[PDB]
Design a protein around this ligand. Structure first.
Ligand SMILES: [Mg+2]
Length: 220
């Protein structure tokens, strides 16, 4: 039996998309650039902040100095942080509150393995703090996804080996990270996106304790 479960934040527990959208819309209104609408945002999924901005600049063939580029990206981060004040328990994906409760109930360790500098705060905002046993520090990490680094850390943080854990992810860099760390991955999202050799669910509503158990045993 598995002894821990390692969660990414974005894509698994909550959908940050709307909040990154409001942050980028605010920025583009404020520097007079047309085109940053929902459909345009969609093609920023798991795209670097710096890469994100260049795309936005490109919408107007805009050229800025190196100092202005970094100043503008910070200002977006600031808007993002004003925005997430509105995050709440309604933001929690489906099946996740019940799972965390079933995981705590059966004494199975629960850890966050996310790259977000706002992890602890977001969880507090979502009333999920009591359920978490540890939170991997993204600053202490050497390399990022698809590195196995963040996941090893989370696992050791709750006192288990990666080989004793199931990892949950929506991105394939994440899947790869979980694959290389030793944990058993179970992704969520479309197969076309994530790969052949892992177990996948259409959405988080499928992440139940009963089901994680079945898989874990099937894999053994
Ligand atoms: Mg993710």
């Amino acid at each position: 039996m598995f002894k821990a479960v390692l969660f990414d934040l974005d894509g698994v527990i909550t959908d940050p998309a709307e909040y990154h959208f409001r942050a980028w819309k605010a920025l583009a209104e404020e520097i007079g650039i047309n085109g940053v609408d929902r459909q345009f945002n969609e093609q920023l999924k798991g795209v670097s902040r710096e890469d994100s901005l260049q795309k936005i600049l490109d919408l107007a063939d805009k050229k800025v100095s190196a100092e202005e580029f970094k100043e503008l990206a910070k200002r977006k981060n600031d808007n993002y942080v004003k925005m997430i004040q509105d995050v709440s328990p309604a933001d929690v994906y489906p099946g996740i509150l019940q799972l965390l409760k079933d995981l705590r109930s059966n004494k199975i360790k629960i850890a966050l393995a996310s790259a977000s500098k706002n992890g602890p705060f977001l969880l507090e905002r979502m009333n999920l703090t009591g359920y978490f046993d540890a939170i991997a520090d993204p600053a202490e990490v050497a390399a990022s996804k698809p590195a196995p680094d963040i996941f090893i850390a989370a696992a050791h943080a709750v006192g288990v080996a990666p080989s004793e854990s199931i990892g949950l992810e929506d991105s394939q860099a994440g899947i790869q990270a979980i694959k290389d760390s030793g944990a058993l991955p179970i992704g969520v999202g479309r197969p076309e996106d994530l790969g052949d050799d892992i177990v996948i669910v259409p959405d988080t509503s499928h992440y139940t304790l009963e089901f994680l158990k079945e898989v874990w045993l099937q894999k053994q």
